[PDB]
């Protein structure tokens, strides 16, 4: 049976990552949350995030424009789960961008097929087969981040390139973009809290 998990499941280990534009002074998160429900008896684990860059993209100037979403989600630190599949934006297809920066990174970016006019709150899922029991959630490793591009649906937004700034006090990790990628936000898992970890 079936077990949900939230970004506050993962507090211990691994990273929340922001979004300073031109501002590493006035940091903001594009995550309204993530979820993930894992299935004990088939090992799937399927993911939903919850994109909103409406508000660091709050301008008018905006409203005209065709808009992609886009997800980079990397799996290749877990030897036991295995490359996303499914993987759907607002319940519509993806096209896949491998990366072509060489800056080895594995991991690909998931991009909607479609635009939005405009810039709005996506709902991103996609489903990961995981090959372990419950108890090597404590070493579950995945890395997600929701991306929006004004126009050009290429885009390779990996968080290779970042900085550190402050969100509610803290000293708050952000992604610089590699290029045209805007509002990057996302989450490192890296382990499953230890008290969160299921009955087995």
Same mark, same amino acid.
């Given at each position: 049976?079936?077990?949900?998990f939230t970004?506050?499941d993962?507090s211990?280990?691994?990273?929340q990552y922001?979004?300073a534009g031109g501002?590493a002074?006035?940091?903001?998160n594009?995550?309204?949350?993530i979820?993930?429900?894992?299935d004990?008896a088939t090992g ?8 909103d860059?409406t508000?660091i993209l ?6 005209t424009?065709?808009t992609?979403?886009?997800?980079y989600? =990397? ?6 789960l *295995? ?7 607002? @319940?519509?297809?993806t096209?896949? &961008?491998t990366?072509?920066?060489g800056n080895?990174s594995?991991?690909i ?5 479609g635009?939005t ?9 996609f489903?990961t087969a995981?090959?372990g029991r419950?108890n090597d959630?404590?070493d579950?490793?995945?890395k997600m981040?929701?991306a929006t591009?004004?126009? =050009?649906?290429?885009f390779?937004?990996?968080? *290779?390139?970042g ?5 509610n @006090?803290?000293?708050?990790?952000? &992604?610089i973009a590699?290029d045209?990628?805007?509002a990057i936000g996302?989450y490192?898992?890296s382990?499953?809290?230890a008290?969160?970890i299921?009955?087995?």
């Amino acid at each position: 049976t079936k077990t949900t998990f939230t970004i506050s499941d993962f507090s211990n280990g691994g990273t929340q990552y922001y979004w300073a534009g031109g501002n590493a002074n006035n940091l903001k998160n594009p995550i309204s949350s993530i979820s993930a429900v894992y299935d004990s008896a088939t090992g799937k684990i399927s993911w939903t995030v919850e994109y909103d860059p409406t508000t660091i993209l709050k301008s008018p100037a905006l409203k005209t424009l065709k808009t992609y979403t886009g997800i980079y989600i =990397d799996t290749s630190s877990d030897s036991k789960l *295995s490359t996303p599949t499914n993987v759907l934006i607002d @319940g519509a297809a993806t096209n896949p &961008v491998t990366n072509f920066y060489g800056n080895g990174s594995k991991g690909i970016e998931y991009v909607s097929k479609g635009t939005t006019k405009g810039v709005t709150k996506h709902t991103i899922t996609f489903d990961t087969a995981f090959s372990g029991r419950a108890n090597d959630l404590a070493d579950l490793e995945i890395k997600m981040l929701a991306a929006t591009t004004l126009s =050009d649906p290429h885009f390779y937004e990996d968080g *290779s390139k970042g900085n550190y700034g402050r969100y509610n @006090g803290q000293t708050a990790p952000y &992604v610089i973009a590699n290029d045209s990628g805007t509002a990057i936000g996302g989450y490192q898992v890296s382990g499953v809290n230890a008290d969160s970890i299921p009955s087995d």
